[PDB]
Design a protein around this ligand. Structure first.
Ligand SMILES: CC(C)CCC[C@@H](C)[C@H]1CC[C@H]2[C@@H]3CC=C4C[C@@H](O)CC[C@]4(C)[C@H]3CC[C@]12C
Ligand SMILES: *[C@@H]1O[C@H](CO)[C@@H](O)[C@H](O)[C@H]1NC(C)=O
Ligand SMILES: *[C@@H]1O[C@H](CO)[C@@H](O)[C@H](O)[C@H]1NC(C)=O
Ligand code: NA
Ligand code: NA
Length: 588
């Protein structure tokens, strides 16, 4: 059919200086630089095409932009008429070539204006075959799976091996994980083995808490050591295409990533709540001076249900991501805001709850130990001053000893153990002070013999009321055994590592914002530095502003695996040597 008067524009034709347009030979011989606003010359138009050929990277955009660019920069001109590109040719780029409007914006002549791009025009570029599909620039890899595509750059996905770190750093972090993972694995297994060998004696609170603590660090170690199996790391971290496993469970991928995630994360969070059960056990152990065997229902409910709820909540929002350096799948690697709510929030909480029971625990210990020490001090002041009154050859010696006794009795009256028991204790000293005041009156009158005799009566007021409560105060504090204080030592030892773990995830969370910015800028640099560069000069490589600290990661792994080793030393006693020697004697 004859061409529409509107699907063309009046422009003087000039012969084509280039027989080829972006790698494809042209079916016509004349062109016009009227459609390209940025160009006035054919040489200028060609140079702009070299700038636009920088979109070779991001194939989904390159596939549709190629016919549009030839239709604008090198269009067909015949008998003082240039053929305009159709609207459908222009509109087809808007979607995949979203990278253009995000960075430099679409030029005025390349915006789909009803005038600049009329509807249903015979494009002519439809007859030209653009064989070039496109390739992905480092650190992106070519993929046709849409679930793996990196933001606006369609057709490209981030490579499986962490681009922010070298192979030297990869092997170094793997050797670090191999060393800490295996020793924790052997330490926890040995500890679990002693517990099951003497199961009926071992299965008793609070000793049984550390078994379940070691159980968590053992299961967790299995997940961390999984990657060291022949080609397992790539089965857990890499996608089918060759990209990083991000946004899992997804659909068409293997469960190998989510399986390792559940193994690591569930065991991690179960280990932190079992630590809180330990801090609570040590808190309530001083309140026995209420058995823990009854509260087993509350412990096993919270320690196994709460990590399950969090594991399920992550798999629902699908935030399971894989990392090649760590060699495991975890929550919030890509979306760090999810790592704050599922890693920093529960670790922040266990520090508050666990910390409270550890602080209130020593507060109960040091308060009860001081109250006894102060009572013993006042009790000894009374006994020492009684001897002074017995030996006193004058009333000034009797008066001075009694005033010191009055101050000691009133001070010891204020003392409270950690009420009808308090009523008789306070009244016991009320009688004594009242008797001291009567003895002081005799000393003030000068009656030494009468004040000395009145002082002998204080001895029985002390034995009848005071002595009965002093023996009780001593017995309650004697009830504090070594296993009780050892539990607290382990509690603070575990608290330390949890405080370090928190600080590491807090550092990663605080600086991820810039690490992602430094990455996007690095990726965009790889496509910018390739364009607008002299033909003779080799392409200079781009750099990353900032990346995660491998030292902070190593400190986090030391804190995580450190707890697993430190909690395994609960069975490094005399009694556990007996269990292995008696089983060895049974075998041979
Ligand atoms: C991740 C990668 C693929 C995205 C980066 C694509 C780069 C190469 C794109 C994005 C915006 C583009 C520019 C948008 C506008 C113009 C104006 C025109 O007069 C000459 C070309 C030029 C300057 C384009 C050249 C290529 C460009 C810089
Ligand atoms: C390269 O050019 C684009 C133009 O849109 C710009 O947005 C981008 O930031 C540039 N890259 C660098 C690293 O400056
Ligand atoms: C390039 O074109 C030829 C035909 O000219 C075709 O056989 C080949 O497959 C094309 N290349 C690609 C990668 O499509
Ligand atoms: Na022009
Ligand atoms: Na899956």
């Amino acid at each position: 059919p004859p061409p529409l008067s509107h699907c063309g524009r009046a422009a003087p034709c000039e012969p084509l200086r280039y027989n080829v347009c972006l790698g494809s030979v042209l079916p016509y011989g004349a062109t016009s630089t009227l459609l390209a606003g940025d160009s006035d010359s054919q040489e200028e138009a060609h140079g702009k095409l070299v700038l636009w050929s920088g979109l070779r990277n991001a194939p989904r955009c390159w596939a549709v932009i190629q016919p549009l660019l030839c239709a604008v920069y090198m269009p067909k001109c015949e008998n003082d008429r240039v053929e305009l590109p159709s609207r459908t040719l222009c509109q087809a780029t808007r979607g995949p070539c979203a990278i253009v409007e995000r960075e430099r914006g679409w030029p005025d002549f390349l915006r789909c204006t009803p005038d600049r791009f009329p509807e249903g025009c015979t494009n002519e570029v439809q007859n030209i075959k653009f064989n070039s599909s496109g390739q992905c620039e480092v650190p992106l890899v070519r993929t046709d799976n849409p679930k793996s595509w990196y933001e606006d750059v369609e057709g490209c996905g981030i490579q499986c091996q962490n681009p922010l770190f070298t192979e030297a750093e990869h092997q170094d972090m793997h050797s670090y994980i191999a060393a800490f993972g295996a020793v924790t694995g052997l330490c926890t297994l040995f500890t679990l083995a002693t517990f099951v060998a003497d199961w009926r004696n071992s299965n008793r609170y609070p000793a049984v808490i550390l078994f379940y603590v070691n159980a968590c660090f053992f299961v967790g170690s299995i997940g961390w050591l999984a990657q060291f199996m022949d080609g397992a790391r790539r089965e857990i971290v890499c996608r089918a295409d060759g990209t990083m496993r991000l946004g899992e469970p997804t659909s068409n991928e293997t469960l190998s990533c989510v399986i390792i995630f559940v193994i690591v994360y569930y065991a991690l969070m179960a280990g932190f709540v079992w630590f809180v059960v330990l801090t609570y056990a040590w808190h309530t152990s001083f309140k026995a001076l209420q058995p823990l065997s009854g509260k087993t229902s509350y412990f096993h409910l919270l320690t196994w249900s709460l990590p399950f709820v969090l594991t399920v909540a992550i798999l629902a929002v699908a935030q399971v991501d894989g990392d090649s350096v760590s060699g495991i799948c975890f929550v919030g690697y890509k979306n760090y805001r999810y790592r704050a709510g599922f890693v920093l929030a529960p670790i922040g909480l266990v520090l508050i709850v666990g910390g409270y029971f550890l602080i209130r625990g020593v507060m109960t210990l040091f308060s009860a130990r001081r109250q006894l020490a102060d009572l013993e001090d006042n009790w000894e002041t009374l006994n020492d001053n009684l001897k002074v009154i017995e030996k006193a050859d004058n009333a000034a010696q009797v008066k001075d000893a009694l005033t010191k006794m009055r101050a000691a009795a009133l001070d010891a009256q204020k003392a409270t153990p950690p009420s009808p028991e308090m009523k008789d204790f306070r009244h016991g000293f009320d009688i004594l002070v009242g008797q001291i005041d009567d003895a002081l009156k005799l000393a003030n009158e000068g009656k030494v013999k009468e004040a000395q005799a009145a002082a002998e009566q204080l001895k029985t007021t002390r034995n009848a009321y005071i002595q009965k409560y002093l023996e009780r105060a001593r017995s309650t504090l004697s009830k504090i055994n070594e296993t009780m204080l050892r539990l607290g030592i382990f509690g603070f030892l575990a608290f330390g590592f949890v405080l370090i773990t928190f600080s590491c995830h807090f550092y990663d969370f605080f600086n991820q914002a810039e690490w992602e910015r430094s990455f996007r800028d690095y990726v965009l640099c790889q496509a910018n530095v390739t364009i607008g560069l002299p033909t003779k000069q080799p392409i200079p490589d781009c750099e990353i502003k900032n990346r995660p600290s491998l030292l902070v990661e190593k400190i986090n792994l030391f804190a995580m695996f450190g707890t697993g080793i430190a909690m395994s030393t609960w069975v490094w006693t005399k009694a556990t040597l007996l269990i292995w020697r008696r089983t060895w004697c049974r075998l041979t």
